[PDB]
């Protein structure tokens, strides 16, 4: 993990050698293993309006 946290949009773990990124509640990771897509409409740790 550590340098640029791990290529992932939020969480990261060291799984034997590799970094196993995950996401917070209601974010689904991307087919990368890195991004966490917003599942809700107003989700956790986001603030503002539209666009």
């Amino acid at each position: 993990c550590s340098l640029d946290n791990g290529g992932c949009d939020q969480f990261c773990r060291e799984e034997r050698s590799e970094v196993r990124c995950s996401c917070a509640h209601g974010y689904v990771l991307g087919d990368d293993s890195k991004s966490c897509v917003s599942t809700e409409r107003f989700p956790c740790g986001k603030f503002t309006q539209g666009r």
Binding site: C1, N5, C12, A24, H25, F42, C44, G45, F47, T48
Partner: protein, 241 residues
């Protein structure tokens, strides 16, 4: 909050003013989800009704946007040592869920290791509330945000008269004029990591406000994670702790 700007629209949507038996606020919380507000367990001692107004930004102007909820259940971590302010936490359930909207969205809870390593090694955190705008001076009828730097444990130990316990971290300014304050207890400490903000603390306590040589002390939520979540499904009795 002594110092630091008012919060604009958008800004602090994971706040909660725990209001009382008539219409004054006395402590703060974080929206964790649409049924539970997070707060400091010492707050539950200055109230009778703790009517949760979620949506309120600038008190005075008590016009439509806000919404008071009442509570269905409060839980204080059993180990909360009362004039110790240790394990100073409560998640409380509400009867009426939160339809998030403008100025209402939840704040994310981290997971313990990424939290110490990545998040709490960041320079600053954001704390908010309507509490006192100076120590010997009264309450902001405005939700204010203060960006505040994490201090080092070793340093803020010396600085206190009271015991900083494993469960605590301080943050703020020493000489600079800005701190958390009276009636901000419970209100959120969030850390953004690249546009997700996470909850790193609860506002716990202080010796006065914006004090000299003195930093503000918060409840380290990393250390509190599984507790929150246990309670997250079985509310009621405090359990194990």
């Amino acid at each position: 909050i002594v110092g630091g700007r008012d919060c604009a629209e958008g800004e602090c949507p994971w706040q909660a003013l725990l209001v009382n038996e008539e219409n004054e606020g006395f402590c703060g919380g974080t929206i964790l989800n649409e049924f539970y507000v997070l707060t400091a367990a010492h707050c539950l001692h200055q109230a009778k009704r703790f009517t949760v107004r979620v949506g309120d930004r600038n008190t005075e102007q008590e016009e439509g946007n806000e919404m008071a909820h009442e509570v269905e259940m409060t839980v204080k971590h059993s180990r909360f040592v009362k004039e110790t302010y240790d394990f100073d936490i409560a998640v409380l359930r509400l009867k009426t869920p939160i339809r998030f909207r403008r100025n209402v969205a939840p704040a994310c809870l981290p997971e313990k290791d990424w939290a110490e390593a990545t998040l709490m090694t960041q320079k600053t955190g954001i704390v908010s509330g309507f509490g006192r705008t100076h120590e010997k001076g009264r309450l902001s009828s405005t939700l204010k945000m203060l960006e505040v730097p994490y201090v080092d444990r070793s340093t803020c130990k010396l600085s206190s008269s009271f015991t900083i316990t494993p469960n605590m971290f301080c943050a703020g300014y020493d000489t600079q004029p800005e701190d958390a304050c009276q009636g901000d207890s419970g209100g959120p400490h969030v850390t953004r990591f690249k546009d997700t903000y996470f909850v790193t603390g609860i506002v716990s306590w202080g010796e006065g406000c914006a004090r000299k040589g003195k930093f503000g002390v918060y409840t380290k939520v990393s250390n509190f994670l599984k507790w929150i979540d246990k309670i997250m499904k079985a509310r009621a009795g405090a359990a194990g702790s």
